[PDB]
RNA sequence: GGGAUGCGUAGGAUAGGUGGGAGCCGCAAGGCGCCGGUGAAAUACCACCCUUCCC
């Protein structure tokens, strides 16, 4: 355990008052800060890029792009992802820098056909992999609408070359204990990773624009 | 810790990074950002992690 709910939900609570959260013109969203010390980059210590599927729902959808199949896209459609592109769309988009660009910075999750990996790999990756992103494969069934909306709640715990993990843990009209809660799940993904209890030094949790606040331990 | 600092090319520009972000400051006017665009990466605003210097 690197925290405990009662020590977040005390953060949490103390991060959406009013006195370290003034109020702002669209519904703030809540982030989770853990720095780290003594942590050895080069030796794999705080490696990290696990997909979290938040335990309570926030009020603000993750952008999530699907690429599916003639027989997905329907299903696709449904789960009204960010933005959809079938795979004659894709195809077209070789070459072309700027679009490509944009899909890679405006777009969270990356849903792809398994039998369009390949020209996903090449048409997206290069965009995807400089920004920290990657696209991921979805199941070969037809009905991928629960799929996507799982990935429409996720956030992604990775590590690059700082000792710190900076996530999205909800929006802040929701309750202190439900934050709390996908603050554990985003918790529990690095401790199942990683043994980095002893270089923890703090966690911070705030709305978009409030001021940080630091977990009691 | 507080104040500074970070100059290939392209990008109206000295882009150290990363997360949040569709808004931010202001009575307003207006400025800034998003958008558009360039780029390997995007920039307001809120934060956290750095380099170098000062106390
Ligand atoms: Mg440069
Ligand atoms: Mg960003
Ligand atoms: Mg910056």
Same mark, same amino acid.
């Given at each position: 355990?690197?925290? +405990?709910?009662?020590?977040?939900?005390?953060?949490?609570?103390?991060?959406?008052? =009013?006195?370290?959260?003034?109020?702002?013109?669209?519904?703030?969203?809540?982030?989770?800060?853990? =720095?780290?010390?003594?942590?050895?980059?080069?030796?794999?210590? /705080?490696?990290?890029?696990?997909?979290?599927?938040?335990?309570?729902? #926030?009020?603000?959808?993750?952008?999530?792009?699907?690429?599916?199949?003639?027989?997905? /896209?329907?299903?696709?459609?449904?789960?009204?992802?960010?933005?959809?592109?079938?795979?004659?769309? /894709? @195809?077209?988009?070789?070459? @072309?820098?700027?679009?490509?660009?944009?899909?890679? *910075?405006?777009?969270?999750?990356?849903?792809?056909?398994?039998?369009?990996?390949?020209?996903?790999?090449?048409?997206?990756? #290069?965009?995807?992999?400089?920004?920290?992103?990657?696209?991921?494969?979805?199941?070969?069934?037809? +009905?991928?609408?629960?799929?996507?909306? *799982?990935?429409?709640?996720?956030?992604?715990?990775?590590?690059?070359? @700082? #000792?710190?993990?900076?996530?999205?843990?909800?929006?802040? +009209?929701?309750?202190?204990?439900?934050?709390?809660?996908?603050?554990?799940?985003?918790?529990?993904?690095?401790?199942?990773?990683?043994?980095?209890?002893?270089?923890?030094?703090?966690?911070?949790?705030?709305?978009?624009?409030?001021?940080?606040?630091?977990?009691?331990?």
């Amino acid at each position: 355990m690197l925290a +405990d709910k009662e020590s977040l939900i005390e953060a949490l609570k103390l991060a959406l008052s =009013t006195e370290y959260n003034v109020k702002r013109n669209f519904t703030q969203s809540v982030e989770i800060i853990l =720095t780290f010390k003594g942590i050895d980059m080069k030796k794999g210590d /705080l490696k990290l890029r696990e997909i979290v599927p938040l335990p309570k729902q #926030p009020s603000k959808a993750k952008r999530v792009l699907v690429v599916p199949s003639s027989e997905q /896209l329907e299903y696709a459609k449904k789960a009204s992802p960010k933005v959809v592109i079938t795979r004659e769309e /894709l @195809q077209k988009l070789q070459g @072309q820098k700027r679009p490509v660009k944009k899909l890679a *910075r405006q777009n969270e999750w990356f849903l792809i056909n398994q039998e369009s990996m390949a020209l996903a790999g090449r048409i997206l990756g #290069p965009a995807l992999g400089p920004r920290g992103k990657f696209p991921t494969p979805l199941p070969n069934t037809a +009905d991928i609408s629960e799929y996507i909306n *799982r990935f429409k709640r996720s956030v992604l715990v990775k590590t690059k070359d @700082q #000792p710190q993990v900076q996530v999205f843990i909800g929006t802040e +009209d929701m309750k202190p204990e439900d934050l709390a809660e996908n603050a554990i799940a985003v918790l529990n993904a690095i401790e199942n990773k990683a043994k980095v209890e002893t270089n923890l030094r703090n966690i911070y949790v705030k709305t978009t624009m409030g001021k940080a606040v630091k977990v009691k331990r």
